[PDB]
Amino acid sequence: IVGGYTCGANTVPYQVSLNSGYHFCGGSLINSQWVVSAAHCYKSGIQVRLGEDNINVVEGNEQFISASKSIVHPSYNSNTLNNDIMLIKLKSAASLNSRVASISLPTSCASAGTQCLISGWGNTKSSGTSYPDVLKCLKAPILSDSSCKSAYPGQITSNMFCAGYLEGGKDSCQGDSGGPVVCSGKLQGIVSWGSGCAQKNKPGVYTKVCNYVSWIKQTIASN
Numbered sequence: 285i286v287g288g289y290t291c292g293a294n295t296v297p298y299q300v301s302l303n304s305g306y307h308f309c310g311g312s313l314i315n316s317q318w319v320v321s322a323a324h325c326y327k328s329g330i331q332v333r334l335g336e337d338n339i340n341v342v343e344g345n346e347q348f349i350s351a352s353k354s355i356v357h358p359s360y361n362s363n364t365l366n367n368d369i370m371l372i373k374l375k376s377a378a379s380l381n382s383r384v385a386s387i388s389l390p391t392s393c394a395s396a397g398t399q400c401l402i403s404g405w406g407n408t409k410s411s412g413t414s415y416p417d418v419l420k421c422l423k424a425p426i427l428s429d430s431s432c433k434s435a436y437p438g439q440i441t442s443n444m445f446c447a448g449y450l451e452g453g454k455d456s457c458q459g460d461s462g463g464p465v466v467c468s469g470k471l472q473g474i475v476s477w478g479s480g481c482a483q484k485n486k487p488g489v490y491t492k493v494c495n496y497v498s499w500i501k502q503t504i505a506s507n
């Protein structure tokens with residue numbers, strides 16, 4: 285996250301860290317046995333880390349659980365990143381409490397101007413790499429479809445939306461992929477891609493979760 289702030293320990297209880305010997309992507313806890321992340325974060329040997337704040341120090345509240353299976357959307361296109369969503373089922377359910385909690389899926393999609401909270405342990409530099417130890421936060425508004433397509437002509441599908449600042453300086457970045465975009469207590473997006481990080485007129489692009497609620501429900505119900 286570039287231009288964000290330190291969230292504060294366990295203030296984002298649905299945020300998870302996908303780990304393979306190091307943090308490589310974020311995710312969101314939607315119930316005690318399933319996590320939603322981005323398809324492009326897929327890999328084998330994933331350990332999901334819940335109740336984290338500093339990812340390099342065991343401070344207490346952490347629950348490390350192996351992924352039993354990862355289900356990448358069947359129509360995921362790695363070239364356009366269309367349908368960039370993945371569900372991970374945990375080997376054992378997580379103990380939920382105030383520090384580890386799930387986030388609600390939306391019933392409707394959000395409108396432009398809605399203010400959301402984006403979080404993650406991704407790079408904090410737009411020009412260079414600086415990874416934080418603790419979770420960073422950023423409040424960002426959803427932009428209009430016209431501004432989004434103007435910024436990324438021919439690359440935005442109906443399953444994506446832009447959130448951020450056209451002036452540059454505040455954005456999600458590498459390491460934040462797969463993590464949550466929460467607006468009014470509902471998971472509306474998944475950090476997906478962008479051109480560099482926090483560059484002017486190049487906002488972040490997120491997977492539009494409201495378009496996938498039935499898929500998620502059906503898939504969880506049959507696995």
Ligand SMILES: NC(=[NH2+])c1ccc2[nH]c(-c3cc([C@@H](CC(=O)[O-])C(=O)[O-])cc(Br)c3[O-])nc2c1
Pocket residue numbers: 324325455456457458459460461475476477478479480481482487488489
């Ligand atoms: N500006 C943004 N809003 C943004 C958001 C998520 C991103 N995730 C990534 C991302 C980048 C890589 C690198 C690979 C590298 O530098 O070694 C790449 O350019 O392909 C890899 C992953 Br996996 C990402 O999620 N970039 C991102 C940029």
Ligand SMILES: [Ca+2]
Pocket residue numbers: 336337338339340341342343344346
């Ligand atoms: Ca820790």
Ligand SMILES: [Cl-]
Pocket residue numbers: 433436437438439
């Ligand atoms: Cl277009």
